[PDB]
Design a protein around this ligand. Structure first.
Ligand SMILES: COc1ccc(N(C2CCCCC2)S(=O)(=O)[C@@H]2C[C@@H]3O[C@H]2C(c2ccc(O)cc2)=C3c2ccc(O)cc2)cc1
Ligand SMILES: COc1ccc(N(C2CCCCC2)S(=O)(=O)[C@H]2C[C@H]3O[C@@H]2C(c2ccc(O)cc2)=C3c2ccc(O)cc2)cc1
Lengths: 229, 233
């Protein structure tokens, strides 16, 4: 796999080049816009995923399982990244900048906004860099579904092992970026841990988003398979 | 004085704080019903929770927090903590979950209690991963402490609130240093050290997922008052 031969700088360059554009917005009127926005973002996400080194080496079925598991987390991490320089607010799009009080417009929707704002403030706290962000987003794509592959074929074992090797490459990339920026080794491993522990909170926000939502709108396995073909 | 500890002092503190293995209620009616399996698991969890509170109060830095913040961390983390304990106990029992020395369940017993079998499968996958990584006890206790301090930290506008979180993050940093020191003394290169750190911390995202799905399918949940009372005593 070409992915495993990449240096840290080449991994970063690939991921930065794959970044989707920032899209614009075009009770049920709030969901209306958010749903229309997310629907358009999903098409770009599929095409971004195909450009994450290592992803297309997987079978189509495994590519869809990973996207099925990660898509809301990926949308949320993008939102939190967009929102860092707007404290107390969430920039869903350049023309859709929302404060806490506009969260309440939907029943259980403020709990999630508060958690999203706390994630943006954490990123701001830590001075998260764009090169670190793209690494974290690709970690979400590969990691979130890797522990729920249902098969036990030789192929499934080889797919899981490939995913973990690619994840190790991204870990190496994160450490290299920190080393280049002048962090000591102790600081390097401390910051890596801080960044990966935030992914647990992003999993949590995604899960709660789903729980509240369970308005047919969660992309199915078959939809993702069609979009990825 | 948690931030003054060294790695060995941190490891020893955590090792020394481990709670005991508890048994399931003896000689239940077998085969189980849905209600009786849930009853056994609830009774075991309720007894484990008391010992979890004692353990938490011995995690370096935990008791420096206010009582409110201590309860908040426990409310967020308790199921994850129980589950990582289960996964650890089950490592040497492939295909089965050792809920207690006298309660070892296979997959078909997960299929009791409707939808429970999904979390069963997820829990066995985690135990298999730990076995494949050959997770060491000293690493397990570090990971369980991270769950306690991490799971609730992001869901606390005051100076004190800000001091509280900074303290939690500095302790989390010391525990990260401890994990690296343990991997370093075991002979892993720098690259292997950071890669293994990452692999372990990413599994915690899966434990979070399993904990969330448990509640969703699911009161039996420990209340804020219950947790607070236990902490003050
Ligand atoms: C379809 O499964 C979903 C799961 C959760 C949510 N949610 C809410 C929970 C309570 C009930 C209303 C929705 S939620 O709050 O967890 C979710 C986060 C934010 O609000 C939401 C929303 C969204 C809305 C509609 C949609 O079809 C896709 C995403 C968002 C969004 C959209 C674009 C983006 O780039 C980043 C975030 C929305 C959709
Ligand atoms: C047989 O294979 C399994 C058994 C139980 C589960 N689970 C779910 C519970 C119902 C809805 C969906 C399933 S689960 O993994 O979410 C977890 C909850 C339930 O099972 C586990 C469990 C437990 C885990 C570790 C312990 O050391 C002690 C107890 C139980 C428990 C019951 C009542 C409580 O007050 C607290 C916990 C998963 C797999």
């Amino acid at each position: 796999s070409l992915a495993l031969s990449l240096t840290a700088d080449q991994m970063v360059s690939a991921l930065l080049d794959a970044e989707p554009p920032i899209l614009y917005s075009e009770e049920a009127s709030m969901m209306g816009l958010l749903t229309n926005l997310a629907d358009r973002e999903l098409v770009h996400m599929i095409n971004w995923a195909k450009r994450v080194p290592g992803f297309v080496d997987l079978t189509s079925h495994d590519q869809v399982h990973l996207l099925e598991c990660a898509w809301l987390e990926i949308l949320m991490i993008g939102l939190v990244w967009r929102s860092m320089e707007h404290p107390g607010k969430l920039l869903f799009a350049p023309n859709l900048l929302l404060d806490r009080n506009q969260g309440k417009c939907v029943e259980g929707m403020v709990e999630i906004f508060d958690m999203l704002l706390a994630t943006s403030s954490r990123f701001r706290m830590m001075n998260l860099q764009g090169e670190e962000f793209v690494c974290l987003k690709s970690i979400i794509l590969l990691n979130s579904g890797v522990y729920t592959f249902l098969s036990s074929t030789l192929k499934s074992l080889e797919e899981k092992d490939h995913i973990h090797r690619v994840l190790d490459k991204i870990t190496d990339t994160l450490i290299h970026l920190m080393a280049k920026a002048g962090l000591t080794l102790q600081q390097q491993h401390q910051r890596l841990a801080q960044l990966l522990l935030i992914l647990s909170h992003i999993r949590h926000m995604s899960n709660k988003g789903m729980e509240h939502l369970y308005k047919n709108v969660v992309p199915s396995y078959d939809l993702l398979l069609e979009m990825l073909d």
